[PDB]
Each structure stands twice: as structure tokens, then as C-alpha cells.
Subunit: 445 residues, 8 copies
């Protein structure tokens, strides 16, 4: 029955910075703080740690993947799940210390995974796939899926899910790799995949769409041109014409794992091509982040709502200057809608608030580049602008994921943000997940 | 949470003579390729902080400590120190992994620099040395070197007391731990110590006009007998520090609730020991050994058999392993033949595996940096008087190294033998300065 | 005569018999330490 | 003479004293694991 | 409160072969006068309630139980039962005393009557028998006798389960414990059992046409060989109960968290055992014994050496002590020579003291009621094949007795040997029916 | 840190039966109840247990003496002190179980002793005397004295007291063997002895006196006859003319034993020849019982008061029908005052109360006989009458002491009284201390 | 020769050496059980 | 022949294995008495 040190007590799962009088981008990250690292690194030049997932409530939940044979051979892999708490050191130094940990080494392959912090432990939603995507989209059956939890007891239990009846309309199905959220007794996982052509869940998603545009730029393309693309986007070429729809799954947290699954596929009127993403609850406000894998790069956060066991997404917040770099003409600066799949997962943690409770600004680490996945940088962002920053490295640095969660310490009253990133460097090493710690500061004063 | 005792799978497997055969050929035993287990020794959180100088020891509890420096591994003037207490476990699928059940990081201003851990019934004992200045400077000092005896308990709390060094160490200009693990024997912790002596002190003059000369197997020195006897004498006062005698010592503090209790230094005759250097006091089964780093002219790995009297230990003519070398600068290099004055070389643990029923040592395991001069290309293998086994390379790239520390246990349930070999490696794949707990399975030939 | 040869046990059976009574006692002690509440 | 056989109790008597003091401890450690409230 | 372990003063002193000498004369060892220690076994609160039928056993924990009857020790129909868990201690001045750290009294309606305690790792185990009717009646029964296996733990809580007697005991008309302590061996409690057998049952017919005849030392029976063989046969079906075979048994329940686990009865051949009676299964050092009360024609104290197979035990030709007698009614009296049918005699424990290195039994300690016929004049002494030591009388008055149970330990610190001998005595000084834990120091002659 | 079972909680140290409408002697003892005996019996025909002392507050304190060589040789003896709690059994049966016990076997002789229950343990006041009384009264020095406590820790500590400065006026000094009482942070012990002729404490007690008479009888003796005796009583012949004055000692209960002794010798205007006795606190009311060792047999209880560290006794309650048997003409029925020493210690526990809070009746076991100490019987008594009864034995029975303490169980609401007696019988044995348990009952209904 | 006679230890020193390692281990276990809080 | 002396290690080697497995336990029981919070 673990829980955080008192200094943190009260400042964990709630709204951090509320100012109207403030100027959001006037907040900036401290240079990178030095704490005790909680994320295991590799024991070998063979195995590599990848695809991190993080969530925190009264407990801090973390999981990542260990592939083998130099980050190849999906066929096999382990999975790491840690359950932990935020502590202050004797000198008051912030550090994360995991109180309970389990590494899944069995022959089965959990591939994508996402963790959530629930009162009963760290819940996890993974998929068991022995094959590549491209083949999985030619699959005549939906993807196998598991739900499991690491109890405070330290014992770990997992219930497999019935993917045929639940997912029947889908050719492939995956967790979003992001964080899962505990809302109204349900664990809410980001999910995605693709679904059978001419299926109840398919047709319902045809003739429904949304086209988002950027701040100062406006697309040259005709609407009979544009609309025909944004149309062409939801069933991108790379994967053969099958439609890829975003989704959210909701299970009940109980001593019985895999209880009462309800899958909510929103309308594509409000939502773009399904990608990886996280679900967040800050205070009373819930959101789904979606990877920029489609034509639109800028950071995406959808305010979401609970209707009983179901869910509905509303008009998403847009953040420019926070951009997944992409292939053309989907790249970081793209104004116009097009069909593509490329991009990267970057967590935009909501930060600055109006008393309105709408969202002034968010903080996360992005990849600064037009096309390639390179040069990770941390900062806070505005509907338009970006703050001063802290670069992860001054040398060439390759990235895959950055997932951020921010918390404040009460007793001292200083705000810090954890942004977990998957980096490839000369100093850090090749495939390495680094729990970067940062503090927030007003500019003048 | 969790119980500070190795999973029963290990009961009977930790801390004993592992492989015992007279007839079999030691070097036919050999390491598997590198295994993948769950990793304990933590890496840094930034591109500044760097982990280094590791120390490890294990009994019923596994103790690990490593230093965390900053500003790109510069500015000694500050650092933290990480001490972890842990257990050897087997997974649900039977996989070996080291899980550390208790840890404390020391962030206070004070700098403990060279530090070594030992596994004692009461916790993890540690012997560090608080030094704000440079080794070169320190040897010019008019005072000894502050030294702490700390411990981490199973209650997860840390304590320590500063040894009174003006008496215990009063004859020394500089006093450091061996960075290699300590060992619990006869109700006391026993740590490696080394440093310089105040010229013409009691403990300095006791050591004058004495020395030891060790020669290699198929190789004999051209140098004139008298020549060597002279240069071999000068080996103990390397020109680096001005020629204060740099001597190997061992300190034994009584392990008890009150730290730093009744410390007694052991300063062996240099008719046995070489020029003092880093090292480890270890026990396998019923016998204890001191490892000395190759910092002097002598290339081959050494274990001086150690016997303990009361508060004092005695050292006997050392074991030697000829294919097991440190690299060194000339004419101290890996191929070094004759005696000489120098300070160079690297810390590589020769953990004993194959034993005679004679209870005499046949062969050892360790990761040696294989190269003549620089410290590069770490490789694990089994070593013997003359020869080394088939090897496991750590990588195919240029990868430098600082320390490697090896200890071998056995999971009894499966009756398979393993070796943990911890390396401080610097690499493209792993990272700039990174500590990797390399795991290996020991195998035979022809099966 | 034909006696020594049955003493091979003192260096054979006997020590191994100690290693057992150790291993089991240790297993006992081990489980017991698992009592941390 | 005759001391040959009389010591062969080395494989009879002592291997017991072991087993006996073994069980004494084991029982005493067992009763202990029951003394935790 | 308090820890259920004998003061360290006793470590190495409890439950072993106490005095071992081949050359010395057993009977030259002998009891001191009666010592004064602090008293454990509690006396009654009224002139009605009366304590009786005591049982004792000790390992690392000391277990004692005695029955509390009412209406002047009449009306079996009701009673309580007192089970105490305790430790051997030494005072500040070094005085020996038994302090009982945990006790429970059983006041529920149910009557456990004949009961015996054993010391097991998990607590004090007890085997009682729930009987509302008379022994004479019970032997006329068409059903077995309800039997409980209870235990008191170190958590001071009591539990029990009724053995299923229609199967286990199905061949018996009446089934009782020996009132003498049980013993823990090979991960099981082993209790003495005795009673009648259903005529012509499987276990009855197995015992027909068989018997044992034991004769005394300097004394030989006049009776014709055939005569004896006949009367010796009839000894097993005493006229008291109508001639159902009254047989000695031992039951072993597995000691575990769940009581009454896997019980297995041992019903030895009557070529070894006499007509069944009260008794105790005891272990001293590496060997185990069964005591049988003298209830048949045989006067001298008996210990059948007991060896345990798996769930079954086997009995070998009994030890005998000729100067150690029960009194008995004729022609069963203390001086009894030949075989005969009868039920008489008394329970007196022969606790083994002097041993051969042969590991064979020389002499024993116990309090015998010294008299031919009635049960009177208890006296403690050391006994031997032929002879008894100098004695310690319990009193100079006419004092009757029911049970005496003796076990001998040694305080190792002082290296002095003691014997606890518990007696149910009836006296002017002590009281009507009173249980007195008599303590004695064992001494030598000529020192 | 022990304490009683809840069923007793609330009913321990407080007033038991309050009725004006009632008739006191209409209450009677149940026959003798059967519980689990807490008082150790002898291990031998040599040693004998004698001189019991009992007290209870939140803890139950008991101590007695073990003499040797067939109840002879004062020279040596042990002392037993038990610390315990009142428990209910599973079937609800009342029993006393001592949770902490210590037997003092050392060469020193604590002779008379009295125990009190204090928040810090069981406090005890004994004397160390190696000689008989008759010789102790020829003593040129006061009697050595000890104060000690059995902690809940089980550890026992004892501080000797300075008898010369404290007791200087006394030739001999002893604890009253009764119970000690905890009042206003002081342990209050009954004490007695005799004091040096012509001493500050002596002369003050000359010319001061009290003469008590019985209910229906009035002495024939002249006052110039009587007054001259009651005079002659305080310095009885047996002991050589030395005056024997009752007394009470008060020590502070603290981690430091033997702290701040203050000895209070009351005036003999209010008090008779000093004897053994107990000090009791029931609810808010305090009392000193005094043995009937002098000319006046009937049960004696003095209401006492605390002035800081000092004490003052008031007019004592009288109970007829409760009579220490005595030698002539001091015997059980004696009307007239005379000088004698004979009698017996019998505890009169206060029971029935007026709302006035004065004392209607008391309960204890007495010895029914004119002269000899024989035939112990339990009952409740009135200023005049006595109840129905329960006899301890129908055979010849010798007694020494009876000390009673009464308590109620709340949960069940039944009142029981423990009367500890020192008996000599054929059934019980020779010198035997038996914790007789009794219940109280209304007569009709 | 002159060898047996130095084996008197196996039945002399040896067993007594077991009794010690028992007694001490037991002392250990004993103290430990004194930990009942 | 020669087996005489070679077993006399009965008074050398094994009396150690005892002392060693002794201390192993003692240390393991000691560390345990430190694990109580």
C-alpha cells in the first residue's frame, strides 16, 4: 500500500500553473536536472530498451520493451513494468524510486503496451503479435490482446481478452503506447489499428472527416482537391487501402482483470487518422493526445468526456512550434492535407490554465527538424509560440519517443516536469530511455 | 519492501569453490556469449552526470556502490555516491537477475572518492575516503586522508563515522581504499587500502631495504641481477609522486552497531607485496585472497593468498595468471619482462573458479582489457597459470575501459555456473561512460 | 583390510551430508526471513 | 587392530548426531516462524 | 508476553542422554532431597474442584496438562482441562524454576478425560478422548470412543478437530490416550493409546494365539510351563471387561497447521507388548521409548525401545527395572512372580539417565510408590536392572498417589543434572488431591 | 502496558452497590466459585506460603512469603510478586491471570510486605529483619526497610530506605502486610512497630487515646478503671512497655524508587494500638483497615484524607458480627478495654453505599470463633448484623489471614468478590493461600 | 601405525565440536526469539 | 597403505567445513535479527 512522500502530497494529479495575467511562453525549462535514474538500461549489445509508457496518480506506473538481436526480431521480446513512488531525499532532492518491479520474460510477445495507475496497481494493455504490421493488415483476424496489472503485493496477473467478439470489425488492433488514464473506475487506453472494409465499424466512418489548418498559413489547394485528400488520408497507401481509425478502450479496474471491456470508436468528423497516443486526466480535465502521424504535425490534444462506459472527443487544442517532423509533403511545416504515414510520438503535458479552465499552454519535449527524427528539445508552448528551451544534446541525436508528465512539490513549492525520451546518442549510447528531469521558471523574477 | 535474502534457488550456490577438478583442463571451461538479464546498476539522468568507479561484494546479500561525478566526469571537487543492497533472484521462467532491494544515494557536499563495499551480516559496509584535492597534490600533503566507514542496513537507513586518521594513518601522506570490494571475515570487515608513506616514518623505515621480484612464465629478463635488484627496489617509490613509498595495506574494522569500531591497519612486508595499488579482499569457500592492481611493472593478474590472524592478516607468495594482463605504458606494458619503476595499468578482477581438492587454486575468471598499452577492448575468459580460454568480446568497436570487477556464483536448482563481471565501459553502443553488469554462463569443452 | 575402502565415505558421503544439512537449514532461515510482514 | 572396525562407526554414529542436531535446529527455527503475531 | 524458549542456561541441556558411563555403578547416582523452586501446576480454588491426571513433555518448549474434576473428584460427567505452554528458566540467583508462558483452560461442556501432551515445533499438541460414560460401560459399547487432537500455540490460541473414529478406531469398543505425554518424531506427534477390541475383528484376530511372558531377576515361577502359557494368554482379556482384548497402540498424527492430520494407528504384536495400559512415548537423544503402565501381572517398570518406520513404529524387547515396582492387588502385587490375568497397578515414569556409549540403557530415574498392594508412600530414586539408589521419600506420613511422571534435564552453565517428577499426591500437608512438581538434583557417591 | 479485559472495564476501582431502599444484610455470598488459581502453592514439605498481600487498579498486584524448614527459620525466606489482569474466558468465566511475575530468592529477608498497584507497576514495601519481634523491640536501632516495584517490563528494581533518619524515633518498623493504595501520586503503605521511650514521636502520643464500645453491650468497668487500661493498652506487656503506634508511609511513584518518603503518625486520640492493616481507595473514598489485635475485636475502617504528602484519619466505622477471635478478656465478644496483643488480620471490603456516600455495609471473610483462629466464613456485614454465609470448610480449619477485594463485571453486570485467605486444612493442605471467589446475590429476587 | 591413536579425535574432539556449533547456533536462535517486541 | 595419513584430514578438513557452515548460518541468523523494523 505505497504512496508518495508528503512534500509531493497534494501536488500530484492536479492543475499546476493557473495564471491569466501571465504570459505562457514566458515560462521555460531549467537545464537538465540530475537525479537517481529509475529506468533500467541494457545488459548487452544485443538487447535494447524501447517504447516507454508512463502514468502516475497515487502511484507511479512505468513500462517499456526490451527487443533482442540488435533491436530486431519482433518475434521475441520482454516487457518491463515498474510500480513506484515520488520521494524527496535527505537533502530534499527529488527522485523517483520504484517500490515494485516485474520483467516479463516469457515466450509470448507483448509488443505495443500502455500503462495506467489505478488504485489496485499498475494496469497495462498490450497486444500479442508475432508478425509485422504490413502482414497484420492483411490479417483475416483481429489482433490478440492482453490486460494485466502489477499489484502492490508485487504479484502480477494478466487476463487475455477476446479479440474476435470485441474487435471483430478490425483487421489489426493495438494499445497506443501512451499512458492509460483512470477515470470513473474505468481504465482508459488509447488504441488503434485498422478495420475490415465494408464493416459495421467501417462504413460508419466513411463520409465523416475533419480538416485542421495552421496558425498564420492557409492552404493553396482547392477544396475539391483538399477534401478529396483528407478523404484519402484515413486509408493511407502504405497499408493497402484499409482504413485506420483511432479508438479508446475502457475496462473496469477490479480484482478480476479484463472485466467489462467497452471499445469507443469516435466519429472521424472530430478525429484524424488513428495513431499512437496517450490519455490524460489533469485535475477534473481529461484528454487524448494523438501522434502527428498524419498530414497534420502540430501537437494534438482532444478534450474527452465520459458517458458511463463510453467516451466522446471534442474539438482538439492545437499547438504550433511543437511539430512531429515528417515526410513530404506532411513535414513539420505542412499547411495542406495529404495522405501519408510518418511522424513521431511526443507527449504535450497540459500546464498553463485560465480560471476558465481552458488550456493556455502545454509542456513536452519535441524533435526540432523539418523531416528527420533528430534533435530533441524541451520547452513550453503556446497556441502559437514556443518558450526558451533546453536541448538534450549539442551533437547529432536520434529520437523515437518523448512522453512527459508534470508534477509539483508542495512543501517547497517548486514545479518539475518528467519527460521520458527514447534517445540514440554517442554519450548516452544507442537505444536508451532517459528520464530527463526539468524545473519550470518565470523569466523575469 | 522485499526480503534481503537470495532466492532459495541460490542456496548453496553463493560464495563457494565452484568447479573442482584435478584432471580436467582449466582453460577448457569458458564463458558463454553475454546473457540478457534485468539490469541493476543505474545509468545517469543527464549528459553531464557520469557513473564510475564501481565496487561489488556478495554473501547472503549483494552490495554494490558506484561514484557519480559531474561536468563530464571532471571536477572531483563534487560527486555523489550510490550504495545499493540487493539479492540474487530467479524469474518465473527461471531467468537469473540481480534485483537490489535497498538503495541510498549520498548527495551531501562531502566527497567520498575511492570507495569499496563489503557484505556483512548487518548490511552493506562501505569504506570511502573524503578528498577534495588531487592525488598528485595529496602526496605532497602534510596530513593523512580523511576516511569514512559507512554502512547501509536492511532497514534502508545509512550511518557512518570518520575514522581518526591522525593516529591510525599518521604515518601516511595519502590513504585510499582499493575501490575493489571489501570482505567479511572473523567478525570484521577487511578492506584494501593503499597510498604513500611519510619518508623515514616508523612504517616507512620498516619497509626500506626490501622488495620482491616476480618473473613471467616462458620469459626471462635480460637485465643484470644487480641491475634488477636496484630497479626493483625503486619500483616502490615511483617518480610520479616524488618517491614516497607507495605501499599496500589492509584495514579491518570490527563490524558492529557502532561504525568505525576498533580499526587496525595491516601493512604487509614488501618482500611479499608489490608497489601498493587498487585491489580487493575476497573469500571463496574456506580461503581468502587479496587482488592487487597491476599498477607496478608486473603484468599478470595477482592473488596473494590471505590468512587472518586476529586483527591482522598475512600474505603469502601470490598466485599469478600469465595470459591475464593489464595494458600498461612502457616499459610496463602487457608484455613486460623485467622489473621497473612506473604507475600505469588497470583494475581487472580474477575471480577464482576451478579449484583443486588440494584447496589450491587452478584457474580464475575475469574480463581483461586485451591490448598492450592503452586500456581498450575488454574480453571475458577463463585464466590459468599459462593460458586463457575461448573468449567473449564485449564489443567489436574501439571501446575503452576503467574498471572490471568479477564474481562468480551458481544457481543450484539448475546446477549451472555463472559469473557477474561489472565493467566501466565507454562505447558508441553503450554510452560515453557506462557501467554494464555483464553476465556469462560457464561452459565446458566436448561437454 | 577392506575397511579403508569403506572409509571413502568420510571424504565422499560425509561432506556432502553436511552440505545438505546446511542447505536445508538455510532454506528454513530463508523462508523465515520472508516473514517481513 | 580392531580399531579398524570400531571407527567405521564414523559412517554410523556421527552421521546421526548431524541429522539430530540438524532437526533440533530446524524444529527450533520452525517454532519461531509460528511466534510471529 | 515472554519468549517460548528455554533460558540459554539450558541450551544443550534439554532432551539428551544425560549421564554416560560404562564403568561407573548406576545406582551410585541418586536424588538430592526435594528442592524448592517456583511452582507452575496450579491448585484448585475450592474444596470441590480437584486437579488430576497430569501429563508432561518437553523439547524447546515445556508442555503440561492436567484434568480438573468436581464434586469431590466424582462425576466424570463434567470436567475442565488445563493445558499450559512453558519454558525452563534460571533466576537472578541461578535458581531453577519452571515458568509457563502460555496457558488455556477448557471450560466448555465437552469432557476430555484421559489426555496427553507432546511438545511440537508448532506448540503444545494434545490428544484427549471425549467420554461421558464409565470405562466399564465403554467396554460394553457398540461404537468407538470420540477422540480430539487439539493444540495450544505460541500465539496463545487453542484449536482442535475430532478424529474420525468410526474408521481409524472402528475395530475398538473403547479407545483412550495413555495419560502420559506424547512425543514429536519424524515430523509427527506420537501418542500412547490403549483400550478394548471388538471380538473377532480384523485387528482382534490378528492378535489371537499370541502373547509374551516376562520373568523377574533372581525369581522364577513355580507354575507349570503349559499352565503359564495358558494364563499368560488370558492376561490380555482381563475378566474386568468381559474378555475383549485390551491392547496397547500408538497413534501418529502429522503435526501441521490443520489438526488431526493423516492419523495412523500402530497396533504392535502382543508377542512384544503386554496387556495394553497407560503410558508415554518418549525420546532421549537419538532413541525413543514407550512406557507401559504395570496394569497387567508384570511389576517392574518397562521401556520398550521404539523405532519409527514411516507412519508406523515398531517395538522391541522391553527394558526392565526390577527394583522399580508398582503396587498391585494379588496375585499381581509388587512381588509378582508368574503370569496372570488382572487389572491393577499405577503409572510411574522411568525417565532414562545413565547411558552406555553402546547407546544402550543402563539406568533410569523415577518416583515409585513403594508398597506391595495399595498405592502409597511415593519415593524417588535411580533404578537399574537389579537395584535402586539411596532414596528421597516424599513424606513420612501415609500419602496415597495416582500418577507420577518424571523427566530429567540438565542446566549446562552449572553442569548440574536435575529431574522433574510430577506426582498426584494426597496428603495431610499438601492436600486432599494435589499435584506437586517435585524437583531433585542428581548426585554421585564418593563424589 | 497491560490492562483488564473490557467486560471488567469501568467496574474495577469504584463503588459497587449503592442502595438506600435496600437492606444491606439482605445481600449474601454465592457458594464458592471455581476459577483458574493464580496463587502458587508449595513445591515441597519444607517451604510454606504465607502473609499474602493484594491490590488492584488498572493492574492487579499480588505478593506473598515463602518460609522454609516447615514454616520456621525467619532467618531465610523468598518473596513472590505477581503483576496481573482480570480476564473473561471464552465461556465468559471470570479468572485472574498474572501477566508478569517475579520471585525474590536472594539471601536477604523481606519479612512483612504490602503491595500497591501504581501506574508504573506493582509497588511493594517490605522490611529486612533477621531477628524475631521480641528481640527487635529491644533493638537499639530502627528496622531496615525496602521499597521496590515490578515493572510492566517484567524487570524488578528496589531501593532501600534510610531507616535511621526517617524512623529514628522507632525501635521497630514494619509494613502492614495489607494492600497499599495509590492516592494523589503517592503510594500509601500501612506501617507499624514501636518507638523509643521518651522520643519526640513518643511523648506526643502520651495523654492521647480513644475508647470504642460495642452495639448492644456497655462495659461495667469504672472510667478511672477503663481509662487507666485503654491507657495501658498502647504499650502492651508482651513487648516490654514500649509503645506500639499505628502509622502510614507515603512515597512518590516515579522511575526513581524510594522517592520523597513522608511518614504520618496520626494522633492516638483517633486511633488504637498499631497493628497490621490495609489502605483502600474505593472510588473517591479512602480508608485504613486496622487489625483487631487490641482489646477491640469488631472490624475497623478509618476514613482517611490526604493533605499533600501527609495523612489524617477520622472516626472509624464499626462492624459487629465481624470479629477477630482473641485471648481473654480481649476475645471476640469483649465489651471492655484492656491491654493485650492477640488477634487476626481480616479484610472488610467496603460495599453498600448511601447516596450520602457514607458506608452501609462491607464484605470480607471472618473467623467464626470466640478465641481460637478457626472456621473462616464469608459474608456481608452491617453496623450491627451479618448476612447469610458461605463456610470455607465443614471440617476443622485453621486460618491466619483473609484479605478481600471486590469488583464488578460491566458487560454481564454481576458482582464478584475475591477474598484471599491463608488456610490450613486436610483437603487444602497445611499452609495454603487460596484465592476464594464469590458472587453477590439479593435474597428475594 | 601411530595414526589410529590420533583418530581418537573422531570419537572425541569431533562430536564435542558438533555439540558446540549446535549450542552456539541455538544461542543465536534463542536470542532472536527474544525479539518478541 | 598411505590411506592412513590421507584420512587424517578428518581432523583437518571437515572440522573446518563445520566451522564454515557454522558461521554461514550464524551470520545469516544475525542479519535476520537486524531485519526487524
Amino acid at each position: 500500500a505505497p504512496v508518495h512522500d508528503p512534500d509531493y502530497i497534494g501536488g500530484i494529479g492536479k492543475e499546476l500553473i493557473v495564471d491569466d495575467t501571465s504570459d505562457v511562453t514566458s515560462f521555460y525549462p531549467s537545464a537538465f536536472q540530475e537525479h537517481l535514474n529509475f529506468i533500467p538500461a541494457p545488459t548487452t549489445g544485443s538487447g535494447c530498451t524501447r517504447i516507454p509508457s508512463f502514468d502516475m496518480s497515487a502511484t507511479h506506473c512505468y513500462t517499456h520493451n526490451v527487443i533482442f538481436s540488435g533491436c530486431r526480431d519482433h518475434s521475441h521480446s520482454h516487457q518491463y513494468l515498474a510500480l513506484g513512488v515520488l520521494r524527496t531525499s535527505a537533502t530534499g532532492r527529488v527522485f523517483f524510486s520504484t517500490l515494485r518491479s516485474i520483467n516479463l520474460d516469457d515466450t509470448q510477445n507483448r509488443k505495443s503496451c500502455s500503462v495506467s495507475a489505478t488504485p489496485l496497481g499498475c494496469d497495462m494493455l498490450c497486444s500479442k503479435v508475432t508478425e509485422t504490421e504490413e502482414e497484420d493488415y492483411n490479417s483475416v483476424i483481429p489482433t490478440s490482446m492482453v490486460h494485466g496489472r502489477l499489484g502492490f503485493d508485487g504479484q502480477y496477473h494478466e487476463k487475455d481478452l477476446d479479440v474476435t467478439t470485441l474487435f471483430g470489425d478490425w483487421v489489426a488492433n493495438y494499445p497506443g503506447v501512451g499512458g492509460g488514464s483512470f477515470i470513473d473506475n474505468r481504465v482508459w487506453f488509447p488504441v488503434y489499428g485498422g478495420l475490415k472494409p465494408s464493416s459495421p465499424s467501417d462504413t460508419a466512418q466513411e463520409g465523416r472527416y475533419v480538416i485542421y489548418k495552421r496558425y498564420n498559413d492557409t492552404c493553396p489547394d482547392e477544396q475539391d482537391y483538399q477534401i478529396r485528400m483528407a478523404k484519402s488520408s484515413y486509408k493511407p497507401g502504405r497499408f493497402g487501402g484499409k482504413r485506420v481509425q483511432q479508438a479508446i478502450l475502457s475496462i473496469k479496474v477490479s480484482t478480476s482483470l479484463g472485466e467489462d471491456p467497452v471499445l469507443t470508436i469516435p466519429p472521424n468528423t472530430v478525429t484524424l487518422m488513428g495513431a499512437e497516443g496517450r490519455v490524460l486526466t489533469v485535475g477534473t480535465s481529461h484528454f487524448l493526445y494523438q501522434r502527428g502521424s498524419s498530414y497534420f504535425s502540430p501537437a494534438l490534444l482532444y478534450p474527452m468526456t465520459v458517458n458511463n462506459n463510453t467516451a466522446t472527443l471534442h474539438s482538439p487544442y492545437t499547438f504550433n512550434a511543437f511539430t512531429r517532423p515528417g515526410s513530404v509533403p506532411c513535414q513539420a511545416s505542412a499547411r495542406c492535407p495529404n495522405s501519408c504515414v510518418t511522424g513521431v510520438y511526443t507527449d504535450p503535458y497540459p500546464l498553463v490554465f485560465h480560471r476558465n479552465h481552458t488550456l493556455r499552454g502545454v509542456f513536452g519535449t519535441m524533435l526540432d527538424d523539418e523531416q528527420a527524427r533528430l534533435n530533441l528539445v524541451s520547452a513550453v508552448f503556446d497556441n502559437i509560440s514556443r518558450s526558451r528551451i533546453t536541448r538534450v544534446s549539442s551533437s547529432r541525436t536520434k529520437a523515437a519517443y518523448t512522453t512527459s508528465t508534470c508534477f509539483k512539490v508542495v512543501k517547497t513549492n517548486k514545479t518539475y516536469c518528467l519527460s521520458i525520451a527514447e534517445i540514440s546518442n554517442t554519450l548516452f549510447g544507442e537505444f536508451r530511455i532517459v528520464p530527463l528531469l526539468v524545473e519550470i521558471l518565470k523569466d523575469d523574477g
